Amino acid sequence: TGRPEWIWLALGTALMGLGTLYFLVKGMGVSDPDAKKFYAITTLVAAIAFTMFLSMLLGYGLTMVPFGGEQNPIYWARYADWLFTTPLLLLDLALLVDADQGTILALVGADGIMIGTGLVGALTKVYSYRFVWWAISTAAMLYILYVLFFGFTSKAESMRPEVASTFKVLRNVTVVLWSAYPVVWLIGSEGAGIVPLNIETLLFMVLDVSAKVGFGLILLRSRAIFG
Ligand SMILES: CCCCCCCCCCCCCC(=O)OC[C@H](COP(=O)([O-])OCC[N+](C)(C)C)OC(=O)CCCCCCCCCCCCC
Ligand SMILES: *C/C=C(C)/C=C/C=C(C)/C=C/C1=C(C)CCCC1(C)C
Ligand SMILES: CCCCCCCCO[C@@H]1O[C@H](CO)[C@@H](O)[C@H](O)[C@H]1O
């Protein structure tokens, strides 16, 4: 009939909006140039989330895809958000540990794949191929999560305990939250259609807010971002 997911779009909008504005204000107040690069990335992550939630709320970034004999709604704008915001989040982790330039290029890379395949999955009309795309995307994601868990922690260990242990909290936050997205896609409106669209918007919304504003509040309050 109508669109019951709207409420969680509206609450996502509110939350990314407040977070964007809060980061903007704290970021403008501080003088340290190193701390600033973190503000700039993190305020930008939130701002993009905000604009994409707000579009969706207003009914944009939505398409119908036929698969399994039905006409099925898919919010593709969501992938336009992730395309930019996930790699910016990795750049935050990467600058915290002084990652080598070519590790960063690998992650951004893996990441582009992850979002690009997720999206193609979300629009494929042969039901089983949707899961082929989904599996590739999850493979790229695991690769990310591996490098953050093995490669970056080893890097963090070269840093003062305070930047290491901030990194550890953020790594920990990223691993738990990111590792849930594939499960939601698989069981929700984009995959098996078990969990309906409203409940799935809710879940992604909570993961997104946690993965960006939650992440942001942890980083941007740390002494670790100061030079
Ligand atoms: C240097 C010179 C360059 C030459 C010209 C090229 C410039 C083009 C830029 C990139 C092209 C993207 C096109 C686009 O369209 O973007 C993506 C999308 C909108 O989706 P859709 O329209 O197909 O949805 C369904 C369709 N149906 C609802 C209307 C029926 O959603 C989004 O990522 C964002 C939506 C808007 C963001 C909200 C904040 C500010 C918006 C103000 C302007 C809006 C004016 C109408
Ligand atoms: C602010 C948004 C965040 C941190 C979003 C993270 C999203 C992912 C790690 C997405 C992962 C996906 C898969 C692993 C496979 C299927 C489709 C994707 C895009 C949802
Ligand atoms: C109310 C919503 C507006 C959000 C403003 C987000 C600001 C994004 O961040 C911007 O990144 C620049 C690089 O281009 C940095 O060097 C800056 O400090 C900043 O202008």
Short mmCIF file of C-alpha atoms and ligand atoms in Angstrom, two decimals:
data_model
loop_
_atom_site.label_atom_id
_atom_site.label_comp_id
_atom_site.label_asym_id
_atom_site.label_seq_id
_atom_site.Cartn_x
_atom_site.Cartn_y
_atom_site.Cartn_z
CA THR A 1 0.00 0.00 0.00
CA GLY A 2 2.39 2.81 1.33
CA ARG A 3 6.01 2.87 2.75
CA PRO A 4 6.40 1.67 6.42
CA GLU A 5 10.25 1.99 6.27
CA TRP A 6 9.92 5.83 6.18
CA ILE A 7 10.16 6.19 10.01
CA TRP A 8 13.66 4.63 10.17
CA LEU A 9 14.69 6.79 7.17
CA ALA A 10 13.56 9.78 9.07
CA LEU A 11 15.36 8.77 12.25
CA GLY A 12 18.60 8.03 10.25
CA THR A 13 18.34 11.46 8.74
CA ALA A 14 17.98 13.12 12.16
CA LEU A 15 20.89 11.15 13.64
CA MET A 16 23.37 11.65 10.72
CA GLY A 17 22.29 15.26 10.60
CA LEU A 18 22.97 15.90 14.32
CA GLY A 19 26.24 13.99 14.10
CA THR A 20 27.36 15.91 10.97
CA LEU A 21 26.66 19.25 12.57
CA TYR A 22 28.33 18.31 15.92
CA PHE A 23 31.47 17.15 14.11
CA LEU A 24 31.45 20.22 11.94
CA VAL A 25 31.36 22.46 15.04
CA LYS A 26 34.04 20.64 17.06
CA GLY A 27 36.22 20.35 13.93
CA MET A 28 36.08 24.06 13.25
CA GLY A 29 37.11 24.85 16.81
CA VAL A 30 40.34 22.93 16.85
CA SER A 31 43.78 24.29 15.62
CA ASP A 32 45.95 21.12 15.49
CA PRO A 33 46.48 20.33 11.75
CA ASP A 34 46.68 16.53 12.30
CA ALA A 35 43.42 16.47 14.28
CA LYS A 36 41.79 18.43 11.57
CA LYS A 37 42.32 15.79 8.79
CA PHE A 38 40.35 13.41 11.02
CA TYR A 39 37.55 15.92 11.42
CA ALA A 40 37.43 16.63 7.81
CA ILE A 41 37.10 12.90 6.82
CA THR A 42 34.61 12.11 9.62
CA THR A 43 32.37 15.09 9.16
CA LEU A 44 32.29 14.24 5.46
CA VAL A 45 31.25 10.57 6.15
CA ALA A 46 28.35 11.74 8.24
CA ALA A 47 27.36 14.46 5.79
CA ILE A 48 27.08 11.97 2.90
CA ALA A 49 25.03 9.53 4.99
CA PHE A 50 22.74 12.41 5.87
CA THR A 51 22.16 13.51 2.31
CA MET A 52 21.47 9.89 1.16
CA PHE A 53 19.06 9.17 4.01
CA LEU A 54 17.28 12.40 3.33
CA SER A 55 16.89 11.52 -0.45
CA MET A 56 15.48 8.09 0.36
CA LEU A 57 13.12 9.59 2.88
CA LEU A 58 11.86 11.97 0.13
CA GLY A 59 11.41 8.82 -2.04
CA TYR A 60 14.52 8.89 -4.20
CA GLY A 61 17.08 6.12 -4.83
CA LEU A 62 14.37 3.48 -5.10
CA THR A 63 13.75 1.03 -7.90
CA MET A 64 11.69 -2.13 -8.52
CA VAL A 65 13.73 -5.30 -9.59
CA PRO A 66 11.95 -8.53 -10.80
CA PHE A 67 13.28 -11.70 -9.32
CA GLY A 68 11.67 -14.82 -7.81
CA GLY A 69 8.42 -14.03 -9.84
CA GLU A 70 7.66 -10.73 -7.98
CA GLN A 71 8.34 -7.06 -8.36
CA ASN A 72 10.76 -6.18 -5.46
CA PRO A 73 11.79 -2.77 -4.09
CA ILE A 74 15.53 -1.93 -3.68
CA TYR A 75 16.93 1.26 -2.35
CA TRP A 76 19.96 1.70 -4.48
CA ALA A 77 20.91 5.15 -3.13
CA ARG A 78 22.08 3.36 -0.06
CA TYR A 79 24.97 2.01 -2.20
CA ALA A 80 25.79 5.55 -3.37
CA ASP A 81 26.35 6.41 0.30
CA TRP A 82 28.61 3.36 0.97
CA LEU A 83 30.61 3.84 -2.13
CA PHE A 84 32.19 7.00 -0.53
CA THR A 85 31.68 6.61 3.09
CA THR A 86 33.20 3.17 3.63
CA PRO A 87 36.53 4.00 2.06
CA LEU A 88 36.64 7.31 3.94
CA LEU A 89 36.21 5.29 7.17
CA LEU A 90 39.08 3.06 6.23
CA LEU A 91 41.24 6.15 5.46
CA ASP A 92 40.58 7.22 9.16
CA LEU A 93 41.86 3.88 10.45
CA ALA A 94 44.68 4.02 7.99
CA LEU A 95 45.95 7.45 9.09
CA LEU A 96 45.74 6.49 12.78
CA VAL A 97 48.25 3.63 12.26
CA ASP A 98 50.38 5.31 9.53
CA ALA A 99 49.42 2.71 6.99
CA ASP A 100 51.66 2.46 3.81
CA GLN A 101 50.14 4.17 0.78
CA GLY A 102 49.80 0.86 -1.12
CA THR A 103 47.92 -0.82 1.75
CA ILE A 104 45.45 2.10 1.52
CA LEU A 105 45.10 1.69 -2.24
CA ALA A 106 44.47 -2.07 -1.73
CA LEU A 107 41.64 -1.44 0.84
CA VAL A 108 40.00 1.31 -1.21
CA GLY A 109 40.19 -1.08 -4.04
CA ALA A 110 38.76 -4.08 -2.20
CA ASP A 111 36.17 -1.71 -0.94
CA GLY A 112 35.12 -0.46 -4.39
CA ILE A 113 34.61 -4.11 -5.37
CA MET A 114 32.57 -4.79 -2.26
CA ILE A 115 30.15 -1.98 -2.91
CA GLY A 116 30.11 -2.46 -6.70
CA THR A 117 29.35 -6.14 -6.53
CA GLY A 118 26.83 -5.65 -3.65
CA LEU A 119 24.96 -3.24 -5.93
CA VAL A 120 25.04 -5.39 -9.05
CA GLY A 121 23.70 -8.20 -6.77
CA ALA A 122 20.93 -5.99 -5.63
CA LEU A 123 19.85 -5.32 -9.26
CA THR A 124 20.33 -8.78 -10.90
CA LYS A 125 17.13 -10.40 -12.07
CA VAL A 126 18.13 -14.08 -12.05
CA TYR A 127 17.50 -15.07 -8.44
CA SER A 128 20.54 -17.36 -7.87
CA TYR A 129 22.99 -14.96 -9.52
CA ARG A 130 22.09 -12.37 -6.95
CA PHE A 131 23.89 -14.59 -4.47
CA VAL A 132 26.91 -15.01 -6.68
CA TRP A 133 27.42 -11.20 -6.48
CA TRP A 134 26.66 -11.22 -2.87
CA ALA A 135 29.37 -13.87 -2.21
CA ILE A 136 32.04 -11.92 -4.12
CA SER A 137 31.19 -8.82 -2.23
CA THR A 138 31.45 -10.61 1.12
CA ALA A 139 34.84 -12.10 -0.04
CA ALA A 140 36.11 -8.52 -0.65
CA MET A 141 34.79 -7.46 2.73
CA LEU A 142 36.50 -10.32 4.54
CA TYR A 143 39.74 -9.35 2.79
CA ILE A 144 39.34 -5.82 4.29
CA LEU A 145 38.57 -7.11 7.69
CA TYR A 146 41.63 -9.37 7.56
CA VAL A 147 44.01 -6.55 6.68
CA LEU A 148 42.51 -4.33 9.43
CA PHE A 149 42.75 -7.13 11.97
CA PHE A 150 46.22 -8.50 11.08
CA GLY A 151 47.99 -5.73 9.15
CA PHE A 152 46.81 -2.58 10.85
CA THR A 153 47.05 -3.92 14.49
CA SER A 154 50.64 -4.89 13.73
CA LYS A 155 51.20 -1.28 12.52
CA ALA A 156 49.33 0.13 15.61
CA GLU A 157 51.88 -1.63 17.80
CA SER A 158 54.62 0.76 16.51
CA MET A 159 52.63 3.71 17.86
CA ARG A 160 52.27 5.07 21.41
CA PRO A 161 49.95 2.88 23.47
CA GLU A 162 47.31 5.52 23.28
CA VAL A 163 47.00 5.56 19.55
CA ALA A 164 47.17 1.76 19.53
CA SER A 165 44.41 1.30 21.92
CA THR A 166 42.14 3.85 20.20
CA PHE A 167 42.82 2.00 17.01
CA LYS A 168 41.87 -1.26 18.76
CA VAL A 169 38.48 0.08 19.90
CA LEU A 170 37.73 1.40 16.34
CA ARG A 171 38.93 -1.78 14.64
CA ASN A 172 36.73 -3.70 17.06
CA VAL A 173 33.70 -1.52 16.29
CA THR A 174 34.30 -1.90 12.49
CA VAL A 175 34.73 -5.67 12.58
CA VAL A 176 31.50 -6.31 14.54
CA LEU A 177 29.36 -3.86 12.56
CA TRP A 178 30.70 -4.52 9.04
CA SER A 179 30.46 -8.27 9.58
CA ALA A 180 26.76 -7.99 10.08
CA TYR A 181 25.87 -6.28 6.69
CA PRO A 182 26.11 -9.44 4.65
CA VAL A 183 23.80 -11.32 6.99
CA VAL A 184 21.17 -8.56 6.77
CA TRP A 185 21.38 -8.40 2.96
CA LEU A 186 21.07 -12.17 2.70
CA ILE A 187 17.92 -12.58 4.84
CA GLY A 188 16.28 -9.25 3.95
CA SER A 189 14.35 -7.79 0.97
CA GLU A 190 17.49 -7.90 -1.24
CA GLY A 191 18.09 -11.63 -0.74
CA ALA A 192 15.91 -14.31 0.74
CA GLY A 193 13.00 -11.89 1.61
CA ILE A 194 12.63 -13.33 5.08
CA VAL A 195 13.00 -10.10 7.01
CA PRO A 196 10.84 -7.43 5.47
CA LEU A 197 11.88 -4.12 4.15
CA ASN A 198 10.91 -1.98 7.25
CA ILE A 199 12.78 -4.16 9.61
CA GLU A 200 15.77 -4.25 7.29
CA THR A 201 15.85 -0.44 6.98
CA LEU A 202 15.89 -0.36 10.76
CA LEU A 203 18.84 -2.77 10.96
CA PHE A 204 20.95 -1.06 8.29
CA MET A 205 20.13 2.28 9.91
CA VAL A 206 21.36 1.15 13.31
CA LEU A 207 24.51 -0.37 11.78
CA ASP A 208 25.14 2.80 9.72
CA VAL A 209 24.66 5.20 12.66
CA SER A 210 26.85 3.08 14.81
CA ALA A 211 29.55 2.63 12.09
CA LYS A 212 29.77 6.39 11.41
CA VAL A 213 28.52 8.63 14.31
CA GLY A 214 29.43 6.00 16.86
CA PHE A 215 32.81 5.56 15.22
CA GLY A 216 33.22 9.35 14.89
CA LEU A 217 32.46 10.07 18.52
CA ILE A 218 35.10 7.54 19.57
CA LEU A 219 37.82 8.84 17.28
CA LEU A 220 37.10 12.46 17.43
CA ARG A 221 37.19 12.44 21.25
CA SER A 222 40.47 10.63 21.41
CA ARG A 223 43.81 12.27 22.22
CA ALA A 224 45.10 9.86 19.54
CA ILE A 225 44.22 12.25 16.59
CA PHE A 226 46.47 15.14 17.92
CA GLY A 227 50.06 15.86 16.59
C1 LIG B 1 31.06 20.07 -14.54
C2 LIG B 1 29.79 19.98 -15.40
C3 LIG B 1 29.10 18.58 -15.43
C4 LIG B 1 28.06 18.28 -16.54
C5 LIG B 1 26.72 17.64 -16.08
C6 LIG B 1 26.84 16.37 -15.21
C7 LIG B 1 26.36 16.49 -13.73
C8 LIG B 1 25.65 15.22 -13.21
C9 LIG B 1 26.07 14.72 -11.82
C10 LIG B 1 25.91 13.20 -11.56
C11 LIG B 1 24.65 12.52 -12.13
C12 LIG B 1 23.78 11.85 -11.07
C13 LIG B 1 22.31 11.87 -11.49
C14 LIG B 1 21.29 11.72 -10.34
O1 LIG B 1 20.10 11.93 -10.61
O2 LIG B 1 21.62 11.38 -8.92
C15 LIG B 1 21.37 10.18 -8.10
C16 LIG B 1 20.08 9.92 -7.18
C17 LIG B 1 18.74 10.47 -7.75
O3 LIG B 1 17.96 9.31 -8.15
P1 LIG B 1 16.76 9.16 -9.31
O4 LIG B 1 16.44 10.62 -9.70
O5 LIG B 1 16.92 8.20 -10.53
O6 LIG B 1 15.60 8.34 -8.45
C18 LIG B 1 14.47 7.85 -9.22
C19 LIG B 1 13.88 8.76 -10.36
N1 LIG B 1 12.66 9.61 -10.09
C20 LIG B 1 12.33 9.62 -8.66
C21 LIG B 1 12.92 11.00 -10.54
C22 LIG B 1 11.44 9.13 -10.80
O7 LIG B 1 20.12 10.19 -5.74
C23 LIG B 1 21.38 10.82 -5.23
O8 LIG B 1 22.42 10.14 -5.13
C24 LIG B 1 21.40 12.31 -4.82
C25 LIG B 1 20.05 13.05 -5.01
C26 LIG B 1 20.10 14.56 -4.65
C27 LIG B 1 20.92 14.91 -3.37
C28 LIG B 1 20.23 15.88 -2.36
C29 LIG B 1 21.00 17.18 -1.95
C30 LIG B 1 21.01 18.35 -2.97
C31 LIG B 1 20.06 18.16 -4.20
C32 LIG B 1 19.60 19.41 -5.01
C33 LIG B 1 19.18 19.20 -6.50
C34 LIG B 1 18.02 18.26 -6.92
C35 LIG B 1 17.31 18.68 -8.23
C36 LIG B 1 16.21 17.74 -8.78
C1 LIG B 2 28.31 3.80 6.94
C2 LIG B 2 28.27 2.50 6.32
C3 LIG B 2 28.97 1.38 6.57
C4 LIG B 2 30.14 1.36 7.48
C5 LIG B 2 28.55 0.24 5.72
C6 LIG B 2 29.20 -0.91 5.65
C7 LIG B 2 28.70 -1.85 4.64
C8 LIG B 2 29.29 -3.01 4.21
C9 LIG B 2 30.57 -3.54 4.82
C10 LIG B 2 28.57 -3.76 3.15
C11 LIG B 2 28.74 -5.03 2.90
C12 LIG B 2 28.02 -5.88 1.88
C13 LIG B 2 28.37 -7.19 1.76
C14 LIG B 2 29.51 -7.75 2.51
C15 LIG B 2 27.76 -8.16 0.77
C16 LIG B 2 26.40 -7.71 0.29
C17 LIG B 2 26.12 -6.26 0.10
C18 LIG B 2 26.92 -5.29 0.98
C19 LIG B 2 27.20 -3.91 0.31
C20 LIG B 2 25.85 -4.82 1.97
C1 LIG B 3 25.46 20.76 7.32
C2 LIG B 3 26.19 19.83 6.36
C3 LIG B 3 27.53 20.33 5.77
C4 LIG B 3 28.69 19.33 5.99
C5 LIG B 3 30.11 19.89 5.75
C6 LIG B 3 31.12 18.76 5.68
C7 LIG B 3 32.54 19.24 5.43
C8 LIG B 3 33.36 18.19 4.68
O1 LIG B 3 34.79 18.30 4.94
C9 LIG B 3 35.64 19.19 4.15
O2 LIG B 3 36.77 18.46 3.60
C10 LIG B 3 37.81 19.35 3.13
C11 LIG B 3 38.47 18.78 1.89
O3 LIG B 3 37.68 19.07 0.72
C12 LIG B 3 38.71 19.47 4.35
O4 LIG B 3 40.16 19.75 4.08
C13 LIG B 3 37.85 20.40 5.18
O5 LIG B 3 38.32 20.80 6.49
C14 LIG B 3 36.33 20.40 4.88
O6 LIG B 3 36.02 21.51 4.02
#
